Amino acid sequence: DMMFHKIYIQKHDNVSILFADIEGFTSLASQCTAQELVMTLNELFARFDKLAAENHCLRIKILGDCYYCVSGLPEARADHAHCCVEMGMDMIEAISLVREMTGVNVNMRVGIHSGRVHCGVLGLRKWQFDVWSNDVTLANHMEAGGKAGRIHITKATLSYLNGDYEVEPGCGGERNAYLKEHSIETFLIL
Amino acid sequence: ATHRLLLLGAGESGKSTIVKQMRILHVNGEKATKVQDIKNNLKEAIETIVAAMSNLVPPVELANPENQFRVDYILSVMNVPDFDFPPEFYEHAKALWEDEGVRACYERSNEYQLIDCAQYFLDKIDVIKQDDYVPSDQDLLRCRVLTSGIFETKFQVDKVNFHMFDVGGQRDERRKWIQCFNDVTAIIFVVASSSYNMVIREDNQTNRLQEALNLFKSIWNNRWLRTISVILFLNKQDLLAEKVLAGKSKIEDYFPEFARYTTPEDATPEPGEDPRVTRAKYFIRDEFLRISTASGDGRHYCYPHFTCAVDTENIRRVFNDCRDIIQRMHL
Amino acid sequence: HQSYDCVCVMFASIPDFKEFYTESDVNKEGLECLRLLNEIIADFDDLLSKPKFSGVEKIKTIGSTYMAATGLSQYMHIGTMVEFAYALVGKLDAINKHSFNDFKLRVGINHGPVIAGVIGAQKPQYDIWGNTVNVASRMDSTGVLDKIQVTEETSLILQTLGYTCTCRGIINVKGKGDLKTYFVNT
Numbered sequence A: 001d002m003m004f005h006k007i008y009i010q011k012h013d014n015v016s017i018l019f020a021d022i023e024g025f026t027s028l029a030s031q032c033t034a035q036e037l038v039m040t041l042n043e044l045f046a047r048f049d050k051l052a053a054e055n056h057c058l059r060i061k062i063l064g065d066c067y068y069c070v071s072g073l074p075e076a077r078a079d080h081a082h083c084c085v086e087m088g089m090d091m092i093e094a095i096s097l098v099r100e101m102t103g104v105n106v107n108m109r110v111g112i113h114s115g116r117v118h119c120g121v122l123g124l125r126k127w128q129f130d131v132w133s134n135d136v137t138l139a140n141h142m143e144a145g146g147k148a149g150r151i152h153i154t155k156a157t158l159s160y161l162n163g164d165y166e167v168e169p170g171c172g173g174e175r176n177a178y179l180k181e182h183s184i185e186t187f188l189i190l
Numbered sequence B: 001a002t003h004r005l006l007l008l009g010a011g012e013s014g015k016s017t018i019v020k021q022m023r024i025l026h027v028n029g030e031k032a033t034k035v036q037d038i039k040n041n042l043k044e045a046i047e048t049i050v051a052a053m054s055n056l057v058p059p060v061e062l063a064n065p066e067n068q069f070r071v072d073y074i075l076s077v078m079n080v081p082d083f084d085f086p087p088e089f090y091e092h093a094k095a096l097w098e099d100e101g102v103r104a105c106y107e108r109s110n111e112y113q114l115i116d117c118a119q120y121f122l123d124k125i126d127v128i129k130q131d132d133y134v135p136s137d138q139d140l141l142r143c144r145v146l147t148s149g150i151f152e153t154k155f156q157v158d159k160v161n162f163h164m165f166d167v168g169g170q171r172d173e174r175r176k177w178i179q180c181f182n183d184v185t186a187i188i189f190v191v192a193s194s195s196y197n198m199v200i201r202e203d204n205q206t207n208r209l210q211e212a213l214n215l216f217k218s219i220w221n222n223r224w225l226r227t228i229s230v231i232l233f234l235n236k237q238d239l240l241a242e243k244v245l246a247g248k249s250k251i252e253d254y255f256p257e258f259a260r261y262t263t264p265e266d267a268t269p270e271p272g273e274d275p276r277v278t279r280a281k282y283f284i285r286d287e288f289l290r291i292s293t294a295s296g297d298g299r300h301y302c303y304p305h306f307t308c309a310v311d312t313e314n315i316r317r318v319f320n321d322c323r324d325i326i327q328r329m330h331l
Numbered sequence C: 001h002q003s004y005d006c007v008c009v010m011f012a013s014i015p016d017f018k019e020f021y022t023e024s025d026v027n028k029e030g031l032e033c034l035r036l037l038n039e040i041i042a043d044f045d046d047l048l049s050k051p052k053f054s055g056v057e058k059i060k061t062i063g064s065t066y067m068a069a070t071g072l073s074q075y076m077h078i079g080t081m082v083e084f085a086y087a088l089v090g091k092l093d094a095i096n097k098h099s100f101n102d103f104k105l106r107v108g109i110n111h112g113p114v115i116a117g118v119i120g121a122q123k124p125q126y127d128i129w130g131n132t133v134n135v136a137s138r139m140d141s142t143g144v145l146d147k148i149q150v151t152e153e154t155s156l157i158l159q160t161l162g163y164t165c166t167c168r169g170i171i172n173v174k175g176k177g178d179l180k181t182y183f184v185n186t
């Protein structure tokens, strides 16, 4: 406070981190123009923003074509898993309508892990609420090691689900090295 | 009523020992694993001495060339992974340690990297070799195992709480230190006082004391440590006197400013202490204090203690001087 | 929210940081790690208030990736970004002295048309989009430590302003193909 700067960060357990990216982003960039893209991007992420508020997810940041929220925040929730699952569902549905409007193969690639996070802000200028931990770092890799239009969940995300959704073998080890080298059992949603 | 102390200092400085001493003093199957460690210390102590024999300038020759074969036995087992420690090993070890030419090598040890406990274990080989051997407390103190990472050890003294954080002294280990900088009661900074005639493991060139000083100056003038006082521990005080009284190697030859130095007025020498030792040990302390005077501005101070880490009788004493300081240095 | 024409974008990330990140009981489960990161970013923010960096507008920070832009307010704005990117090095070095670490910053700098504005009606936050940016980022990630990577266009512009460039070679930019890239000389 007098020697280290004041830190605006706090620990938060039992939370579920959704990550979502766009398959065929450059192929879409190829069709439309610089502006025409941003319109489609803003329209989708404004659309996305609403769904998060319903599905009790607090949206973190938008990183170009990367959208990521997290349920279980700002305040704890026993639904924290089910929300993200219901979120990705609505998201794959939300891309559908906008994809049919263009007529080109674009899709969302979802990934979700659970566990513990730290959350808050870094620096002084230009604050933007963000999360950090290996569990976030894992969640990110889940999206990276995801499959088109399917929801990629972790071993931890099934133990918070109470088995309501029907799952199938994920095989994330083959789509990502961080997943492989950490022996993460992954699953997919039916 | 809880204080978090952090142990800083270069490699081999003595951090690990200080914690061991707290386990002795203020704490409460398991030791059989350490027996193995002590044997390792022994193995590498003698194997290092012999290996040094030829690479030294000038080279040193065995007093009894009968021992040449044993010398060959040692080098043949130097790198062997899980050593069986057979009775042959101890026999050949003692033989060498008996050899005058080998001792001459040890007496020139400052010219190569050799652990502090060499002589100590080597002198008691017939003690260590027994299969029902149980290490003494002092044996546990002297047993050297490099620390990599941060290891907390909690304890209670007169219903007051302490959190001690042991870190790695080496350079690739100094990066982790940061994690214990925030919310610290004070620094305990440890220094191989005796290592004035030695270089470091990290690069075989940088002088160990000169290193400790520059590491100290880093801590004393650190941006996250501006308000933290530093309880200075000038360790290995036994080994210092041993070197000073020996007078084989000199201080003015590694630190030329010592030639100028004379002993301070406020000198509180121990009973029957040689002035030479007094002059030496306080010079060292003063080198450190020159860093604790240039900056600080009464926002943080420095508290020197002459300490011998492997002396439980001296550690209680000095840590009691420290308890006095902390009781008002959290107010 | 509007479009632009000549905006200079800089990405500077810290590759060495992800390793340094730990989660143990000793570091309060990755809090102390994030605490040093704060100190670093906060040092980088202490540069925007400077007068010669008044033109520098910080956009956001991706993990340890610091993202900024000049010209949102002729080509002197491209040079500024470099003097800024140099500066972060002085700030990242400073930390190393005190933090007993060896962090190296890795800088990618591009320029061209961008679109700047707000996205989402929830929490309105400033962001820039388009190819120019995508390349800026792609040049950071394919960069070398202690070095600033620039495109062929920027190479030239900096050469007028008295900066020398050494050709990196060729890069496969996802969607823009193979292209020539450069390093500014220390």
Ligand SMILES: Nc1nc2c(ncn2[C@@H]2O[C@H](COP(=O)(O)OP(=O)(O)OP(O)(O)=S)[C@@H](O)[C@H]2O)c(=O)[nH]1
Binding pocket: B009, B010, B011, B012, B013, B014, B015, B016, B017, B018, B116, B117, B141, B142, B143, B144, B145, B146, B147, B148, B167, B168, B169, B170, B235, B236, B237, B238, B239, B307, B308, B309, B310, B311
């Ligand atoms: N003679 C003598 N030996 C000592 C003294 N203090 C420590 N030693 C010996 O020196 C050796 C090295 O000390 P150690 O505690 O391991 O340093 P360290 O701070 O832990 O080194 P590192 O873990 O940062 S790499 C130990 O084996 C110990 O017995 C002392 O005061 N006098």
Ligand SMILES: Nc1ncnc2c1ncn2[C@@H]1O[C@H](COP(=O)(O)OP(=O)(O)OP(=O)(O)O)[C@@H](O)[C@H]1O
Binding pocket: A021, A022, A023, A024, A025, A026, A027, A062, A063, A064, A065, A066, C062, C127, C128, C129, C133, C134, C137, C174
């Ligand atoms: N405004 C921005 N903020 C943060 N990151 C950005 C921004 N703009 C672009 N990027 C970066 O651009 C990079 C390029 O994205 P990427 O190539 O993965 O998309 P893609 O063409 O859909 O490929 P893929 O289908 O394999 O994911 C991303 O990793 C992203 O981090």
Ligand SMILES: C=C[C@@]1(C)CC(=O)[C@]2(O)[C@@]3(C)[C@@H](O)CCC(C)(C)[C@@H]3[C@H](O)[C@H](OC(C)=O)[C@@]2(C)O1
Binding pocket: A130, A131, A132, A133, A134, A136, A137, A140, C013, C017, C018, C021, C062, C063, C064, C065
């Ligand atoms: C900064 C902390 C640390 C170590 C932990 C962390 O959670 C991350 O911030 C996430 C995962 C995390 O903050 C979520 C977004 C994103 C962008 C995916 C991050 C980056 O991959 C970071 O690494 C980079 C590249 O900065 C990373 C991994 O770094």
Ligand SMILES: [Ca+2]
Binding pocket: A021, A022, A065, A066
């Ligand atoms: Ca992407």
Ligand SMILES: [Ca+2]
Binding pocket: A021, A022, A023, A024, A025, A065
């Ligand atoms: Ca993408």
Ligand SMILES: [Cl-]
Binding pocket: B010, B012, B013, B190, B191, B192, B193, B195, B208, B209, B212
């Ligand atoms: Cl030392």
Ligand SMILES: [Mg+2]
Binding pocket: B014, B015, B016, B146, B147, B166, B167, B168, B169
């Ligand atoms: Mg140690």
